[PDB]
Amino acid sequence: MLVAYDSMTGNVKRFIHKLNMPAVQIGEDLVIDEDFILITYTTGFGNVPERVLEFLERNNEKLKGVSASGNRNWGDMFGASADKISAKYEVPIVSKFELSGTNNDVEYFKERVREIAT
Ligand SMILES: Cc1cc2nc3c(=O)[nH]c(=O)nc-3n(C[C@H](O)[C@H](O)[C@H](O)COP(=O)(O)O)c2cc1C
Ligand SMILES: C[As](C)(=O)[O-]
Ligand SMILES: [Zn+2]
């Protein structure tokens, strides 16, 4: 299953290298041709990065799930980028993790995506 991601300061990028899954960095040109899972980070006050918003405006029909990187010091806005995307596009939240994730977060993501890919 293809993973589309974005990363400003490298934490999500670190996570997706731990996955060893097919992965593509999103861009404004990018048109994805197959089902994919998004991994986004979370911007101030529970928000979705603009580059991700722009990409999803164009690519949401192939979106099958979303995970967010965030930080629990944001309390109930932790990972709320995923809550927004999930609600808007009616796709599951695969997972939430902090920063570049733990090994357990990596494993958990892959297990959940295997389920959704069925
Ligand atoms: C200014 C700023 C605001 C943030 N806002 C939130 C937030 O509302 N919720 C959250 O869970 N994480 C928040 N984060 C944490 C980032 O989402 C987290 O560091 C993430 O791992 C960054 O991913 P990246 O390194 O791939 O850009 C914020 C970080 C910064 C610098
Ligand atoms: C987005 As890449 C080439 O570092 O896997
Ligand atoms: Zn790389």
Q: How many domains does the chain have?
A: 1
3-state secondary structure of 118: coil
42 lines ligand 1 (CB under 6 A): yes
- Annotated binding-site residues for FMN read 7-9, 11-12, 42, 45-46, 69, 71, 77, 79
Question: Does 23 sit in the ligand 2 pocket, CB within 6 Å?
Answer: yes
Task: Specify the ligand 2 atom closest to the Cα of 25.
Answer: 1
- What's the gap in Å between 24 CA and the centre of ligand 3? 9
Q: Which helix (H) or strand (E) holds 50?
A: helix 50-59
Method: X-ray
CA 118/CA 16 separation, integer angstroms: 21
**Own/partner long-range contacts of 43-49 (Cβ < 8 Å, ≥24 apart):** 43/81, 45/77, 46/74, 46/77, 46/80, 46/81, 46/83, 46/84, 47/80, 47/81, 47/84, 48/81, 48/84, 48/85, 49/6, 49/8, 49/81
Domain containing residue 68: CATH number: 3.40.50.360
Handedness of CA 36, 3, 59, 31 (dihedral sign): negative
Q: For the chain, how big is the Rg over CA atoms in Å?
A: 13
> 9 CB less than 6 Å from ligand 2?
no
Q: Is 25 in the pocket of ligand 2 (CB under 6 A)?
A: yes
3-state SS class at 11: helix
3-state class (DSSP) for residue 29: coil
101 lies in which domain range?
A: 1-118
Rounded-to-integer distance, Cα 41 and Cα 100, Å:
10
Among candidates 73, 69, 71, 52, which has minimal Cα distance to 105? 69
What angle, rounded to 10 degrees, do the helices at 11-19 and 103-116 form? 60
